[PDB]
């Protein structure tokens, strides 16, 4: 035998990144040819260049990439054949590659771990047939081990994350406690690394698909909630945002369990997130309450159908939205003044999210939302600042669906003159928003409009 | 209790329906007292009155009802103690009642089987603790046995139906193949009775809550789909409607498995349903496609978020709506001409469902829907028949959300004059719908309106 084998491989792997066209081309031609020539040996040789910390970063990433593109594809059908092509190679050549990949975890210095993707690619194919019985225990160990380094834990958590989102939820339900233990471990308040924390929280979000049994146990649930709430306090905003994302999904998945955390934690955290000057954070706060509105609206319909059938509803609402109303609305109307200057009305910022939330809130809380919004409207409807003038018009249009029509009509009649005047406003943004609101009126309250105004062809 | 006592029980039971107040009064006083006095024997004596084909219909029904109201209640808490009180009676007395109830199946002549309700009440209490291990096999046999009569099969299927909707889905997953076998059996295209078919199809609908394992098996799924599709061809409309209802639910529960049946059966069946003069049938067809639009819209968002995260979506859409568009739209716009003379205060008829479907279709297929709708609009916008004139206005308003704005603006500009004129149309219906569409415009395309229309206060 001769090491020339791996030597040349590493030379070509480094050319797939060459500024030259010829080398880059010849590089891929060779690689592809070697795959065809003898894949099992090809992948074993690549898993060796990857697991070798002595090799240059470029060579190791290029090696991971090749291993990656051998087990997965953007095409569900192609990806399906690769997994069969992989299961095709004899167990021996595979245990070799699987071990090298797992041994690469923690031996990488570059940011994105190329080993984690490879673990996921192989797990997706072997786990469904119980071919990698030592993967989970290994991964869990890598995280719970006190001597494990940041890279070791971070890369392992990334791998758990990929697995949670690439594998069929039913395939993981059987190993939920293990995976969750590793995930929760990486999220403990005492974690020294913000990168480890981020990787763990991102993975939790993906695991919410198969951890029902875990959330149904009032004992574990308390811990998961404590760890997630603490993560919302982390100084690294990426961790904070990922934590909020979990609360957002958990709220729409376990509304009945939230009464224990709502008043003690959730309320203060999300309300504070809605007030953040950081957009990614504020959006997360707004979605949280948007979800509560969806949930409580469904429950109201449940209570209704149950009544008409002469019985108590199976589930009841704790009316979180109605209770938060006085704190939510001021925050939302103020966010309305943070509208974008341009017509990129396809960009999703707090201002647009807030507007949507105010409407959900109106259809959810109905008659109650009006008392909270009117003051802001009457106060800014005629404000010199277009940002407030616009927000006022927007807010008025946001409450037209939900409240009792008989309570809105007088508001409409009393405001129409201003609206008609606002259609000629100096600001383009105010004009458009006003057309929107009049539209909401002619649309939800035709009578109040039809009679307090008739249409007439314009003149340009 | 001797023959004489049993005879008075039957006399009392027949009085609970007496035109007299005293008798009906005394009757329930006695029955309740007998329950208190000695429940176990009261229930055994009632199950004997019910099981006896010789007893008058009134007495057998009154007996079933007494047995029913002793095991269930509309109050979840009271219902809970009744089930505990029943489990309290010694197995011997219960086995007697259970046997008499099961023996009543098929021995009834009257329409609603009172025995099936009693089977359900007992099953809900005993199944959760594995106390009636011979119930399922018995029921299955009652249906699959070739010599079984119509009433035998019909009453048994109703009982299976009640169980499917009264018992916790988790409690039935373990006996899914059995229940499904009996259900599918009652639905075989060769079934002589339309009443048996209806009872079986209604039962399938209820079982969709716990038969996931059954649908995940490519083998059984083929059969379930075959039997449900055949049922949609039954000459008895009730069966037809129930079958369609199943397809509707199955579509929203198993979109990923539909590719095998969509082209071969589903497409032609539902499209034909949409064209029916029978409203209950047409609604079912429209709901089917409304569901497909919901499903594919969610998938589109899934593909989007997956892209922004640099990866292939876990699930992909087959774009059924886009493909059916040229067949769907013409049937929908035609249904818009079937509007009720201004609803009995918002009834849910084909016309209103169709309008909703057109909207979903527009946001789902965007750009593409316009070419399909415009012709209808331009052709009927000025039609002497208000039904078509209104439909044209409605259709124009239905496509404003979804297609590209720059593609709609010119259409609005070109149509506004007619819309403003339509606001003064002789027909109330036309006027109302027109107000809605202009609202949709003022709402979705502010600029195209703000510069082309004027609101003038009514000086009237």
From Swiss-Prot, chains A, B:
The modification Phosphoserine is found at residue 18. The modification N6-acetyllysine is found at residue 217. The keyword Cell membrane does not apply. Residues 27-107 form the Importin N-terminal domain. It is found in: Cytoplasm; Nucleus envelope. It comes from the Eukaryota. Residues 292-455 are annotated as: Essential for high affinity interaction with RPL23A. Residues 340-425 are annotated as: Ran-GTP binding. GO terms for biological process: astral microtubule organization; establishment of mitotic spindle localization; mitotic chromosome movement towards spindle pole; mitotic metaphase chromosome alignment; mitotic spindle assembly; NLS-bearing protein import into nucleus; protein import into nucleus; ribosomal protein import into nucleus. Its main location: cytoplasm. Residues 335-348 are annotated as: IAB-binding. One of its GO terms (molecular function) is nuclear import signal receptor activity. The modification N-acetylmethionine is found at residue 7. Functions in nuclear protein import, either in association with an adapter protein, like an importin-alpha subunit, which binds to nuclear localization signals (NLS) in cargo substrates, or by acting as autonomous nuclear transport receptor. Acting autonomously, serves itself as NLS receptor. Docking of the importin/substrate complex to the nuclear pore complex (NPC) is mediated by KPNB1 through binding to nucleoporin FxFG repeats and the complex is subsequently translocated through the pore by an energy requiring, Ran-dependent mechanism. This is Importin subunit beta-1. It comes from Mus musculus. The gene is Kpnb1. The chain holds residues 1 to 449 of 876 of the full protein.
